[PDB]
């Protein structure tokens, strides 16, 4: 799709560097608008970044740090909204790019708008043309007090701008790298313009620049894009008749999704009464799931019923991992509003309070769990337990909150033999990262493509047990598993049962008249009768 979601890993080193590049390729390829932060970190000199070439807009900040690449193709990057800021002040951070490797030219020849935040460029031994740019023109009129911390500590000489650059302001050595002013040359009080003339002034709702005086000639929208039209607000979903003021539905009504107006909220998103698309309901609301599959947020007049929150939400907002001091708060939870993280510190207790470490038996609390809204992060797991079968009833991981803004399912450094997530049939969003699990098999026996809900999703896997070793031993899907799809060994891990599933075990045929209490058939499920 045209819209992708950024990341949130910052300067933190990638757990799986062998798949770190394949992550970025799956997230941003074809993506034009980045909802969130564009973080490009720890990329080798031989990296192909040709998937970044379509990115026009970044909502959060842009982090380019610790890279060996000489070129980062962001020539189409038109605007950085900076709703989030690196270290809370910078909308564009370019740090420690080097080790000849090292960033040579920024080449942001379309970047003409930064709505909020400053620019941080430091410790780039190969970077040029950084100090040749009038950054005061890129910053918005409401952001003229934006900081600028730029270091020209170079270890190489730099050729001047191409003779075409009037004023010698460039993003590189080419003629196309010339910086096009769109603020400092405007006539009157224009925030943005296409020239020094008052007729060249652009509409107030335009952001990056204009091609005409219309509010449909913008390069970017200051607030919302209403189908080629830049507007302050989206058309409300409700129209009030000026007599009696009864609320009637608006046919032109639109939901606010990012900086654009949509007719219907995208997948895995919720619709509110205000008329917006969110991943989290407002205070004192409940998620009403329609029968067609769509979910919405509805406000409650009477105080809402007790809801089970996961990590990162409400009273578990600042809690790093699931321990034995919060394990009982997931008891009886069918749906968890938040995330579940299992770090090594989960299974070591608290001697000072005589609190026993989390026991493998207590993990059976999650047996009632059927849905996670956030993500599932497992970096530690009891060596005794051969699989994640305590989540055997888990059906959906929404991924409305992602680990490092990227992964909805992370399994790393575990001693599990198989997965055992027999009920998991959907990963609403985010990537899946399953790496460095020595004894783990039955990974390629999982129809991962069936679980994903968008093409920006994939499974990043490495350093697990070789499939050649798995098939060498008798570790294959059971005969009753349809199309060879299973989460583990035995007929109790089949994704699709070829015929007649009894209880949790797949059999070849139920005993309708064979002796086992005349088991009657009800939708491929064997059940006791009389």
């Amino acid at each position, epitope marked *: 799709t045209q819209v992708c979601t950024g990341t949130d890993m910052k300067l933190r080193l990638p757990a799986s560097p062998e798949t770190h590049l394949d992550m970025l390729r799956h997230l941003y390829q074809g993506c034009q608008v980045v909802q969130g932060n564009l973080e490009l970190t720890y990329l080798p000199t031989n990296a192909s970044l040709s998937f970044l070439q379509d990115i026009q807009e970044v909502q959060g900040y842009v982090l380019i740090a610790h890279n060996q690449v000489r070129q980062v193709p962001l020539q189409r990057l038109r605007i950085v909204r900076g709703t989030q800021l690196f270290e809370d002040n910078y909308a564009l951070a370019v740090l420690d790019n080097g080790d000849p490797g090292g960033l040579r030219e920024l080449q942001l020849r379309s970047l003409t708008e930064i709505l909020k935040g400053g620019v941080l460029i430091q410790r780039n031994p190969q970077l040029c043309y950084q100090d*040749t740019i009038l950054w005061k023109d890129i910053f918005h009129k409401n952001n003229q007090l934006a900081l600028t911390l730029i270091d020209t500590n170079r270890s190489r000489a730099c050729h001047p701008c191409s003779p075409m650059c009037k004023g010698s302001r460039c993003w590189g050595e080419s003629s196309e790298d010339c910086q096009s002013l769109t603020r400092t040359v405007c006539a009157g009080g224009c925030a943005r313009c296409k020239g020094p003339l008052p007729t060249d002034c652009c509409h107030e709702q335009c952001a990056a620049g204009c091609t005409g005086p219309k509010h449909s000639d913008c390069l970017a929208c200051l607030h919302f894009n209403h189908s080629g039209i830049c507007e302050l607000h989206c058309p409300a979903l409700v129209t009030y008749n000026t007599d009696t003021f009864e609320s009637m539905p608006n046919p032109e009504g639109r939901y606010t999704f990012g900086a654009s107006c949509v007719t219907a909220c995208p997948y895995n998103y919720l619709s509110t009464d205000v008329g917006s698309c969110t991943l989290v309901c407002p205070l004192h609301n409940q998620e009403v799931t329609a029968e067609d599959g769509t979910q919405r947020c509805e406000k409650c007049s009477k105080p809402c019923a007790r809801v089970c929150y996961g990590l990162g939400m409400e009273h578990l907002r600042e809690v790093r991992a699931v321990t034995s001091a919060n394990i009982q708060e997931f008891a009886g939870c069918k749906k968890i509003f938040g995330s579940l993280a299992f770090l090594p510190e989960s299974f070591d207790g608290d001697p000072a309070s005589n609190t026993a470490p989390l026991q493998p038996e207590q993990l059976q609390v999650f047996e009632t769990l059927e849905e996670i809204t956030g993500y599932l992060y497992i970096s530690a797991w009891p060596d005794s337990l051969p699989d994640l079968s305590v989540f055997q009833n888990l059906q959906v991981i929404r991924g409305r909150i992602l680990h490092n803004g990227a992964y909805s399912l992370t399994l790393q450094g575990l001693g599990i033999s198989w997965l055992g997530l027999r009920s998991l049939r959907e990963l609403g969003s985010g990537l899946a990262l399953i790496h460095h699990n020595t004894h783990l098999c039955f990974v390629h026996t999982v129809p991962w493509d069936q679980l994903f809900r968008n093409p920006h999703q994939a499974l990043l896997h490495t350093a697990n047990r070789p499939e050649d070793e798995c098939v060498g031993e008798g570790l294959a899907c059971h005969q009753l598993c349809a199309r060879g799809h299973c989460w583990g060994p035995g007929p109790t891990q089949c994704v699709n049962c070829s015929q007649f599933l009894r209880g949790q075990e797949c059999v070849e045929e139920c005993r309708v008249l064979q002796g086992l209490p005349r088991e009657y058939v009800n939708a491929r499920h064997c059940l006791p009768c009389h």
Partner: antibody
Framework: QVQLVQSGAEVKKPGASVKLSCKASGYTFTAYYINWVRQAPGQGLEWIGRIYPGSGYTSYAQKFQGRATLTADESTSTAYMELSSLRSEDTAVYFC??????????????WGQGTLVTVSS | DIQMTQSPSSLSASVGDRVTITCRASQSISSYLNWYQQKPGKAPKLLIYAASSLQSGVPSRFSGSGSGTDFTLTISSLQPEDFATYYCQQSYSTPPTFGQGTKVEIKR
């Protein structure tokens, strides 16, 4: 010809300010760093700061981070060096130079006919 | 700041003789040294930039060499037109510093 013409060879009162101009011609003025080097009578060279016209980016030394303001005009092609508070030790001949080929390199060719500045009462 | 020291401070030689001006740095410089020629009443001229690399227009009798701590400016054939105070400049880090100068005066 590529030339730099300086003006303002005068004497100023100790404590006052002084704005020395550096006219440029023969090349694209905004394409190269215009740095300033001073030299006291019968002394060595001392580097003050550099400035890139077209952007206005400046780089000063720790000795002149409080004074020595640098500017630039694309329309008049002038560097306009300016000290704030003069001392008896600030009596020198101020030059404006630029790199030959590269714009940011720290070797200076194409100097200008410097202007001497005397600071006495 | 990196302190640059030259040697000697003053020098005298006849026309045709060779001149060896040694420049010492108080820090390891990776051949980021520059040489100049300031005649009395005039602005300096870039003789040899970045150690060995000679400047266009400058006579070929001017050669530069050295790396790290010590360097060397060399005039294969001294001429009466070579009367000036010679400075060395480091271009390693801000701020670029100069030497005290070597006032070489020829002999007749």
């Amino acid at each position: 010809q590529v030339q730099l013409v300086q003006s303002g060879a005068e004497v100023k009162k100790p404590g006052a300010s002084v704005k020395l101009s550096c006219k440029a011609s023969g090349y694209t003025f905004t394409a190269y760093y215009i740095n300033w080097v001073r030299q006291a009578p019968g002394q060595g060279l001392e580097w003050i700061g550099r400035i890139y016209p077209g952007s206005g980016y400046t780089s000063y030394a720790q000795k002149f981070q409080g004074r020595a303001t640098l500017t630039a005009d694309e329309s008049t092609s002038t560097a306009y060096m300016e000290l704030s508070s003069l001392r008896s030790e600030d009596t020198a001949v101020y030059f404006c130079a630029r790199p030959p080929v590269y714009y940011d390199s720290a070797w200076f060719a194409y100097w200008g006919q410097g202007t001497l500045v005397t600071v006495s009462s | 700041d990196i302190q640059m020291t030259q040697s000697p401070s003053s020098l005298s030689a006849s026309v045709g003789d060779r001149v060896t001006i040694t420049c010492r740095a108080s820090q390891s410089i990776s051949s980021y040294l520059n040489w100049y020629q300031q005649k009395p009443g005039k602005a300096p001229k870039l003789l040899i930039y970045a150690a060995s690399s000679l400047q266009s227009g400058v006579p070929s009798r001017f050669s530069g060499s050295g790396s790290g701590t010590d360097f060397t400016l060399t005039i294969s054939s001294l001429q009466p037109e070579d009367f000036a105070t010679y400075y060395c400049q480091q271009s390693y880090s801000t701020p670029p510093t100069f030497g005290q100068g070597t006032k070489v005066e020829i002999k007749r």
